[PDB]
């Protein structure tokens, strides 16, 4: 797409120095990135609608004054469905209700009471997927939410939702991997949910997260864990819950220790929860394999491979 809106936005704020690296990286990505033509076309064929009623606080919902025609709704439906799989959500957009694989609204509600007041903050969502959580952040009072995700489809999905939200400029998605960033040190709060178990180097992931935070900034870390003490860390084989390159699944206490090791303070384990099939499952918007498929049919306490079932922790830390 044209990131000139975003470059122009940070040129006049505390992220201006990101222009020293960002535009060159996007320029490289725009070259390298067949299915994208089909996904990006789906976004362009979508209508430009300005929400008459918008709710970013209790969900991500958009309404028109008078309902849309059954034909324009069908257009949105079949266009949005071209961007499957839809994993993080849900979105309610002019009656089109995108029920995503994840009930990310649950995880948001559970995480929120533990967060520092988002009001006025500038935030980085690492591996943001669809960008669902960023819209919630705007609703909770965040000034600016930036997500990064190198998956091409998530960019189209977020821009799709953006243009259905009236080209809202308060959230953005940049097709970068967290590796590619310098030490920006400019975000009040960094979220890293669903990313750590995918990193070859877990400590360097945590340092790289710290490098994006202002002093006394907040880190919200969410990832897969197992049960155990400080010394308990699983590294799975070829597949874990059918995922191909999973590296480190520590216990939450292990993770707590890791955050301390990397220079974080006031580290709180804010929640540990088994992932259930009510939170993650197949929908009309995500139809391929999901959690129930990943579990041992005769023991939901285990994956299909033998490992303990998906369990997710939420840690919160402060950068001194």
Swiss-Prot record:
Keywords assigned: Transferase, tRNA processing
UniProt record, GO biological process: tRNA wobble uridine modification
CDD domains: AdoMet_MTases
Job description of the protein: Catalyzes carboxymethyl transfer from carboxy-S-adenosyl-L-methionine (Cx-SAM) to 5-hydroxyuridine (ho5U) to form 5-carboxymethoxyuridine (cmo5U) at position 34 in tRNAs. Can also catalyze the SAM-dependent methylation of ho5U, with much lower efficiency.
Keyword Repeat: no
Annotated Gene Ontology cellular component terms: protein-containing complex
Gene: cmoB
Protein name in UniProt: tRNA U34 carboxymethyltransferase
Organism listed in the record: Escherichia coli (strain K12)
Similarity comment text for this entry: Belongs to the class I-like SAM-binding methyltransferase superfamily. CmoB family.
Record note on quaternary structure: Homotetramer.
Binding, carboxy-S-adenosyl-L-methionine: 88, 102, 107, 127, 149-151, 178-179, 193, 197, 312
The keyword tRNA processing appears for this protein: yes
Domain of life: Bacteria
Effect of mutating residue 88 to A: Decreases affinity toward Cx-SAM and increases affinity toward SAM. Lack of carboxymethyltransferase activity, but can still produce mho5U
Gene Ontology molecular function terms on file: identical protein binding; methyltransferase activity; transferase activity, transferring alkyl or aryl (other than methyl) groups
NCBIfam families found in the cross-reference section: PRK15068.1, tRNA 5-methoxyuridine(34)/uridine 5-oxyacetic acid(34) synthase CmoB
Protein EC: 2.5.1.-
UniProt cross-references to PANTHER family, sorted A to Z: TRANS-ACONITATE 2-METHYLTRANSFERASE-RELATED (PTHR43861)
Pfam families: Methyltransf_9
Swiss-Prot/TrEMBL catalytic activity: carboxy-S-adenosyl-L-methionine + 5-hydroxyuridine(34) in tRNA = 5-carboxymethoxyuridine(34) in tRNA + S-adenosyl-L-homocysteine + H(+)
């Amino acid at each position: 797409i044209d990131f000139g809106n975003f470059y122009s936005l940070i040129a006049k704020n505390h992220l201006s120095h990101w222009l020293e690296t960002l535009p060159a990286q996007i320029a490289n990505w725009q070259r390298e990135q067949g299915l994208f033509k089909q996904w990006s076309n789906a976004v362009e064929f979508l209508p430009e609608i300005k929400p008459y009623r918008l709710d970013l606080l209790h969900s991500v919902t958009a309404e028109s004054e008078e309902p849309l025609s059954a034909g324009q709704i069908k257009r949105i439906e079949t266009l949005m469905r071209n961007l499957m799989p839809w994993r993080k959500g849900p979105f309610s957009l002019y009656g089109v209700n995108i029920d995503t694989e994840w009930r990310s609204d649950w995880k948001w509600d559970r995480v929120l009471p533990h967060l520092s007041d988002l009001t006025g903050r500038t935030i980085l969502d690492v591996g943001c997927g669809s960008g669902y959580h960023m819209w919630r952040m705007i609703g909770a009072g965040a000034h600016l939410a930036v997500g990064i995700d190198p998956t091409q489809l998530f960019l189209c999905q977020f821009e799709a939702v953006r243009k259905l939200l009236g080209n809202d400029q308060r959230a953005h998605l940049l097709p970068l991997g967290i590796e590619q960033l310098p030490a920006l040190k400019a975000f009040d709060t960094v979220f890293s949910m669903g990313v750590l178990y995918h990193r070859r180097s877990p400590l360097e992931h945590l340092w790289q997260l710290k490098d994006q935070l202002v002093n006394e900034g907040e880190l919200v870390l969410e990832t897969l864990v197992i049960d155990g003490d400080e010394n308990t860390v699983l590294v799975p084989g070829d597949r874990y819950a059918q995922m191909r390159n999973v590296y480190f699944i520590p216990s939450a206490l292990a993770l707590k220790n890791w955050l301390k090791k990397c220079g974080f303070v006031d580290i709180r384990i804010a929640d540990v929860s088994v992932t259930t099939t009510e939170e993650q499952r197949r929908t009309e918007w995500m139809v391929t394999e999901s959690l129930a498929d990943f579990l041992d049919p005769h023991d939901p306490g285990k994956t299909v491979e033998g490992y303990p079932a998906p369990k997710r922790a939420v840690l919160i830390a402060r950068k001194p």
